[PDB]
Amino acid sequence: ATKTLAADVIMRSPVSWKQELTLDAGRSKGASENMLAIANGGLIGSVSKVEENSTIVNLLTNTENADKISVKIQHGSTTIYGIIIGYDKENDVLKISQLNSNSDISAGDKVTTGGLGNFNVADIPVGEVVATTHSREVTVKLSADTHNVDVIELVGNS
């Protein structure tokens, strides 16, 4: 089902560029472009580039997210799926949209990866719901701590 890999952060992006990490493991140790990145309590990003000996991880704290990372939200008995669409830096909440249901979503509801699309590994903690927005979008407080991301677990479908 699953290939896992531990790696260390060896570079961070320049201030104000795309928020991304460089890891000291790439294709020679089993990193793949379909992998998700776990650190400091949960999902911290997705792989954006795999090299022979290093990997670039796109971080969840990027304001816009085009990577269509599949997530699901558990509301009691119901599971609502959607995708991560961005991050709110001021309020420090992940943004989720394109929800496949109009069911009730409540603060504290648990958000995990859904294992659909390209980042096809389910059940990784993302966080818990903070609010539902309309102006439908969902805001989520990440489990992963965003400070001092030094060691990442890379996980992908085998």
From Swiss-Prot:
Subcellular location: Cell membrane
Membrane topology of the entry: Single-pass membrane protein
Record's GO cellular component terms: plasma membrane
Domain of life: Bacteria
The keyword Zinc-finger is annotated on this UniProt entry: no
Extracellular topology ranges: 1-158
Main location: membrane
UniProt signal peptide: none
GO biological process assignments: regulation of cell shape
Disruption phenotype: Cell shape does not change, cells start autolysing earlier. Neither PBP2b (penA) nor rodA can be deleted when this gene is absent.
Keywords, comma-separated and alphabetical: Cell membrane, Cell shape, Coiled coil, Membrane, Transmembrane, Transmembrane helix
Subunit record text: Homodimer. Interacts with a number of proteins in the elongasome, including PBP1a (pbpA), PBP1b, PBP2a, PBP2b (penA), StkP, MltG, MreD and RodZ.
Role noted for this protein: Involved in formation and maintenance of cell shape, probably part of the elongasome which synthesizes peripheral peptidoglycan (PG).
Family assignment from sequence similarity: Belongs to the MreC family.
Domain notes: Deletion of the C-terminus (residues 183-272, CTD) suppresses activating mutations in khpB (also called eloR/jag); the deletion no longer interacts with MreD and interacts less efficiently with PBP1b and StkP, CTD deletion leads to increased phosphorylation of KhpB.
Name of this chain's protein: Cell shape-determining protein MreC
High-level lineage: Bacteria, Bacillati, Bacillota, Bacilli, Lactobacillales
